[PDB]
Scaffold this active site. Sequence first.
Site, PDB file in Angstrom:
ATOM      1  N   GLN A   9      41.273  40.755  44.021  1.00 49.27           N
ATOM      2  CA  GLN A   9      40.975  40.986  45.429  1.00 49.27           C
ATOM      3  C   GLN A   9      42.116  40.415  46.261  1.00 49.27           C
ATOM      4  OE1 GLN A   9      38.325  41.459  43.110  1.00 49.27           O
ATOM      5  NE2 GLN A   9      36.935  39.914  43.964  1.00 49.27           N
TER       6      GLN A   9
ATOM      7  N   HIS B 103      36.441  29.559  32.858  1.00 48.91           N
ATOM      8  CA  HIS B 103      35.560  29.134  33.933  1.00 48.91           C
ATOM      9  C   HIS B 103      34.120  29.016  33.452  1.00 48.91           C
ATOM     10  CE1 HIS B 103      33.356  32.982  35.223  1.00 48.91           C
ATOM     11  NE2 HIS B 103      33.998  33.291  34.118  1.00 48.91           N
TER      12      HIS B 103
ATOM     13  N   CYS C 148      27.059  32.910  33.096  1.00 52.27           N
ATOM     14  CA  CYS C 148      27.685  34.220  33.233  1.00 52.27           C
ATOM     15  C   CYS C 148      27.906  34.878  31.869  1.00 52.27           C
ATOM     16  CB  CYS C 148      29.021  34.083  33.959  1.00 52.27           C
ATOM     17  SG  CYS C 148      30.138  32.863  33.221  1.00 52.27           S
TER      18      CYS C 148
ATOM     19  N   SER D  34      30.130  34.708  44.220  1.00 48.43           N
ATOM     20  CA  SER D  34      29.353  34.743  42.980  1.00 48.43           C
ATOM     21  C   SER D  34      28.480  33.495  42.798  1.00 48.43           C
ATOM     22  CB  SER D  34      30.266  34.940  41.767  1.00 48.43           C
ATOM     23  OG  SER D  34      31.218  33.901  41.667  1.00 48.43           O
TER      24      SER D  34
ATOM     25  N   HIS E 132      30.918  27.421  40.421  1.00 49.11           N
ATOM     26  CA  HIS E 132      31.645  27.528  39.166  1.00 49.11           C
ATOM     27  C   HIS E 132      32.895  26.663  39.143  1.00 49.11           C
ATOM     28  CE1 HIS E 132      33.107  31.625  41.080  1.00 49.11           C
ATOM     29  NE2 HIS E 132      33.201  30.620  41.916  1.00 49.11           N
TER      30      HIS E 132
END
Lengths: 23, 163
Positions: free
Chosen positions: B131, B59, B113, B154, B157
């Site tokens: 999650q 990613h 990131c 976040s 992405h």
Amino acid sequence: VLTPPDQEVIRNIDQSEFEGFSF
Amino acid sequence: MADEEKLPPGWEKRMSRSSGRVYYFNHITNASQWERPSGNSSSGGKNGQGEPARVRCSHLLVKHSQSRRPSSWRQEKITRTKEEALELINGYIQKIKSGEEDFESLASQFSDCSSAKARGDLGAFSRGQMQKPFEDASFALRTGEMSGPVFTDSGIHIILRTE
């Protein structure tokens, strides 16, 4: 308009928040 | 005149802004792709070892101004607007699909990131450590599918599965 291929239905995967990584 | 160059209702044959590139935009669900929906003659699919009980993808994460964290290892003063993040990340995809820069080579380069060192690769992990909403999510994309700018907590992405 966006241009790149982006599937509304099938777009799910380890998209960062698949773990404690970042959030 | 060929009528098969048309698209089914809901699909709109659109063009890239000031570029001239023609693609398919579905204004019904807001999906978009360059491949013909009925082009089942040849589907893209890479071979991956292991069932969807565990997966491995890569990613590219880009952070914006109003993010959880406005600082990163490469830039601690991250002040980029949401429009910028979108345009830059979509721009990356466009050069990737053009064969200019590979996702791996490019991700390791432009990753905002901490996945930059690993070329965007998150690694191979099994269900359980995800999650609740994301656990079943990890297993939805197959080997050879790349999605565009996904909007999670976040930030903005993109994603590409390798195994």
